[PDB]
A paper describes a structure:
More recently, with improvements in EM techniques, higher resolution studies have homed in on one particular kind of structure for the myosin head arrays in relaxed muscles. This configuration is the so-called interacting head motif (IHM) first observed in 2D crystals of isolated myosin heads from vertebrate smooth muscle. Studies of isolated myosin filaments by electron microscopy (EM) have been carried out for many years and 3D reconstructions and other kinds of analysis have revealed the rotational symmetry of these myosin filaments: 3-fold for vertebrates, 4-fold for insect flight muscle.
Here we deal with the myosin filament structures in vertebrate striated (i.e., fish skeletal and human cardiac) muscles and insect flight (Lethocerus) muscles. We have shown in our analysis that the interacting head motif structures for the myosin filaments in a vertebrate muscle (bony fish) and an insect flight muscle (Lethocerus) do not explain the X-ray diffraction observations previously recorded from these same muscles in the resting state as well as our original fitted structures. Turning now to insect flight muscle, the same story appears to hold true there. The compact interacting head motif structure is not the best fit to the observed X-ray diffraction data. The preferred structure that better fits the layer-line pattern has one of the bridges extending radially outwards towards actin, with the other head closer to the backbone in the same position as the outer head in the IHM structure in Figure 12a. The blocked head, on the other hand, would then stay in almost the same place in both the super-relaxed state and the “activated” relaxed state. In either case, activation puts one of each head pair very close to an actin filament. Using further analysis of the low-angle X-ray diffraction data from bony fish muscle and insect flight muscle it has been demonstrated that the normal resting state of in both intact muscles in the published X-ray diffraction experiments is probably not the IHM, super-relaxed state that has been seen in 3D single particle reconstructions from electron microscopy.
Residue numbers in the entry:
A (entry chain D), B (entry chain C): 1 to 156
C (entry chain B): 1 to 840
D (entry chain A): 800 to 840
E (entry chain F): 1 to 196
Write the structure that this text describes.
Amino acid sequence: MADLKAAEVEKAREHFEIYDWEGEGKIDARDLGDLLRSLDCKPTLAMVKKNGGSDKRGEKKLTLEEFLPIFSQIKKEKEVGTLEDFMEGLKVYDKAENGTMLAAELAHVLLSLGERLTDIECEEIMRVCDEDDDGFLKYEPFVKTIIAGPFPDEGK
Amino acid sequence: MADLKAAEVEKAREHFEIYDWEGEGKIDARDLGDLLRSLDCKPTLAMVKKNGGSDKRGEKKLTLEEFLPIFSQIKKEKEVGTLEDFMEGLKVYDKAENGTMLAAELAHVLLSLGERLTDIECEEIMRVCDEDDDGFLKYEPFVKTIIAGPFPDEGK
Amino acid sequence: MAEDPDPTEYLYISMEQKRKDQTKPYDGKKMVWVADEKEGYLLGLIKSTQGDICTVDIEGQESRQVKKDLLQQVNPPKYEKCEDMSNLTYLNDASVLHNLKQRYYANLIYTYSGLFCVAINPYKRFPIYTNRTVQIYKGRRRTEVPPHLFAISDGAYSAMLANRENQSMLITGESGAGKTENTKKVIAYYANVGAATPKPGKEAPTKEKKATLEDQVVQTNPVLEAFGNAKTVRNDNSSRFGKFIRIHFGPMGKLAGADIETYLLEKARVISQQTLERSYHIFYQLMSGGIENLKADLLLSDDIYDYHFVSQGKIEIPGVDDAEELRLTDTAFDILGFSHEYKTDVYKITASCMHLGEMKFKQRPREEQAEADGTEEGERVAHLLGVNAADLYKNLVKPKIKVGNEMVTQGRNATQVSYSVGGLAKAMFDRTFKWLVKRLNETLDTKQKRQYFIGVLDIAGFEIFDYNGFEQLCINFTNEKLQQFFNHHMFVLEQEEYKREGIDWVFIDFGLDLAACIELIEKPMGILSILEEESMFPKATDKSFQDKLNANHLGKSPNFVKPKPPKPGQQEAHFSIAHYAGTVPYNITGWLEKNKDPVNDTVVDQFKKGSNKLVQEIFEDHPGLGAEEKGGGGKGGGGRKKGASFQTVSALYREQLNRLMASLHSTQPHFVRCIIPNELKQPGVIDSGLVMHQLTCNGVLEGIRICRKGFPNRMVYPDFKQRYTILAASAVPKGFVDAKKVTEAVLGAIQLDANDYRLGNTKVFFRAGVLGRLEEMRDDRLGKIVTWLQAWIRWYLSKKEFKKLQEQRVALLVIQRNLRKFLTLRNWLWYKLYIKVKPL
Amino acid sequence: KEFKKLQEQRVALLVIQRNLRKFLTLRNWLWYKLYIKVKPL
Amino acid sequence: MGDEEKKEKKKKSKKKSEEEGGDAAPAPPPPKPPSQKRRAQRSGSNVFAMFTQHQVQEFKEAFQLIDQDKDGFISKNDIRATFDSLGRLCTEQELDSMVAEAPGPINFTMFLTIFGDRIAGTDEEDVIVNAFNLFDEGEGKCKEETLKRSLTTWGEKFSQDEVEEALSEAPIDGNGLIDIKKFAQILTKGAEEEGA
């Protein structure tokens, strides 16, 4: 958890600034989805659609000034999650005794649990090693490129 | 083909500037035949003389106006892609019809009868067709290969 | 969840019992199954036991003194309202019988019988079209995936993809199971493993747009079915012929294509009919189904009994039309990439094989020779070939019979004349179909993915009528060899694979022979037959046929019914040969005339010939099949070899027959033993008498003795460790290691009950029951870490595949930091460029 | 097939004809060439 | 960051080298962690000799703006002020560039370590592909003509003169000026036209 504090406001400004590109400070409706996810409220797709979001093309533009009186509600009941949990979890599957993961196999176990993986996301889990021999991930560089985000900004 | 088309005139105005090395017009006598061959009309040297044209160097030369009655006589007669005496003109050493004739009598009969052309082309009528060791080489596919053509239509 | 899978596709169980440890103390004994004298097994009670002898009464109303081993102790609730029937270890006919009855009651059709399954096939189709299906057969639980043929195909794909060496799935059966109807559900697993590219706006829908290879692999089975399938009334949708299908699977399991050859085809189901045989399915399709365009040109009626080789209406089996089945197949040409031309040209030749029927005893003269007073009848044949009514009505009436090698005729009366009209049709239909598969096979040689296959062998048809053709006989001489791959895989290759893997099992092989006198090499098989290799000439005796049969087929075959010959003239002798199905009274004559041909090579061959040569390619390239080397002599063709040979394509089919059989011999078994449930081919009806009979010939005792440890689920031990998820640790693996007695710890760590596991360090092996439903409850329990990976994969996808909000932004801001001052920053204090500047 | 080599020559003939005129025009209007050798300053 | 915000954190971010007066504020907000400063300034350190050349004349071309006096040692901000507006061509914002190519007053004596401090400067050496490259969706090197593009369509807005000038003044290598050369600009490849 956490209440309204300077650190969260920064987290939200940072994700938002990635999510634009126009340089106009406007993000579309759908991007509310993954902003909130990155903030570690752990929403479901229901929570997104509740906030007039979308899993389709945008409909309208949001400024941060709209987004934040949504967000200060969202924070209540959340877990910021640990990292070490996903490592321990994904060590369970092995394929060399080294924490290595065939791509199809890693999509499938997610599919068949939880709220259940969509057609598209199993293609994304698969995407890395697509259509060759299938196709081995490793748990540590997997989790890490996901959480870090692929270029939140770099100095190189 | 069996009649002049409007695009074969539009093709021939373009290809007029090729024939005269200046980029003007005046159809060269060998390039008389190259224009009829890039418009689906492929007479013999004895059919050329009937239309009153040319297909080889040293023969009459004409202008594009003068080319239209010559071009129109081939359309009324054979060789615009019609079938008769092509793959109907081959075989007489076999009283069997298996769609085959002898290898030896499919490369020195075009050289001992016919208008007589290159030994390399005598080797293409043998190459397009199947080979067996029973002495049976087909005659009927090399002709259909010509129906397929570089361009079935108007060359460019 | 609540420990039952969620219906979407039909026939999913909703359980009462759980196949877990409770069921184990139930086993026998009070009631047992005694054998009826009228065929079948029914339920008896032991009234008194005199030691090793017993007196077990029957509901037949007999009292019978029986011997221990015969009376099967009653099968416990492990096969009542469970997904299970994989755990079978119970012997003889009855064990299986009870359990399949209770399978219908349990809302299912196909079930495991160990590794060597039993399939009870009525044919029904669950929707495949849903975006629901392409998650379900994209791998899920062992009861989200039902114990239908999709399961085995999961555990083949999972097997193959873990251990990196090849498998097969080999279906046997008899007339009363339509092999092909089964195979399309194997393919429907494969074809719906697919997923599609991300949508840019985060759209979950997509898929049913991918992919023409999967589509192709399906579609070919309707094309193959319309020509080769006819029907019976014991076997609705009877494939009477033989096809070998190698299906190829990708990295992700996605179908890559199918190299499909064809073995034989009938020339005896359209030369005349036996009572309650229907001719080839396509005729009726074409007739009922036809659009107004083709109806005009092809000159078709939708009325029957205006023919004689096309008689018998619709036969009731679910999910088959003739009319709607036309549109399916017409599309199935379109999809293959076949030519829009060649469809109608082929239809013209196809539809004359209807038209031909109703002609007999045409000695009425027009020209001082046997022709006919008919017109319309033969004009509707005539136009579609080109040749006129006279070419037709001359050449029908009698064959030019090679006698010595010269040409004579016989006197032929009404029936004789009838049978010779049917000749012209069967030569056309065989020869078109034979061109036809092979030119469609070319296009299906694209792979472009991993080179792993399963080869599915479908050689069916058998038939039990007073007359079957010589064509069907050569098909059933393969059927014998199928029962030998059973022997070779049920004893041998099953436990060779168990040994390699190091899975537990005492390695014991029992004796059983169902044939062993046949060789899987050409040269023995092509001493046979004198009704082949000398029949085209009148030197062929039916006597020597049987003699050469009795050496090569009989010695190690047991269910083989001997030839007793009627010594006068030409045989009406009967024999029969081993198969899972009964005794066949054969008629031996007429086999003669068919390879002296009732309507010759020559007569057919000239419809093949063209007039622009485009016509020719459609049927031939030019050596043989419509063009002729001439002369008398030779076997086979066509007109190689040589001339009017009078066809003997059955000998050519020794050669090739070696080539199909031997590779398939060496492949490691998945098996489906397709049993006739009932004749009407309908869910909730099964006959005891049929199944009792099929299983005694399919050596059911032996067939459970090895398969008492049957495993037809085989996956990855990591994968299954991961589906339960293990967050407790004291000593619990996360390692890729043995499951011998280790599977009890990675279950029991956090919750779960355990009843089924087996050793594995590459492939892990399961049987049905305990796994699946407990893994649906892990959807309900697993909150937290699992579902937050899933939300994180949503955040992954969305960030990458927006396509402009991705890594575009970081670059664009640094790009800007230069753009604000681009005039300044592209130089410095000292201008150093004097090298290559547009004016400087 | 060879007429293809000649078909791209139809526009090329129009370029050499203007260029031959410019072979004499720029020889009355020189100081329009100068390229690397040893003479530049 | 809302509409209004990204106006403010041009002027407020401003993480060196970006702390410059601008064209209408300097660079568009880098995201909240200060990783990207390194692409705001790169700096090396090789000194190159003065009077070794005969394109050495160049220092006399710059001179007047950076040496009002005839033996220099003028005021210390005047390099940071005037040279911005027409020295190494027009439009001011050369503040931190100038304070990082001169380490105090520039004159003919001091010239060794400005010629040298060119190679330290801002966005000099420390060559890296990814910086501009990741724009065009990581597909091919990201050069001149796509930067011009971006300035009229997306991103924060700045004075259009500088860009049209900069394209025209290009040397041309044929794929324009890649990210490599955008850094490595000190060693080969510069500008044309007015100034310094």
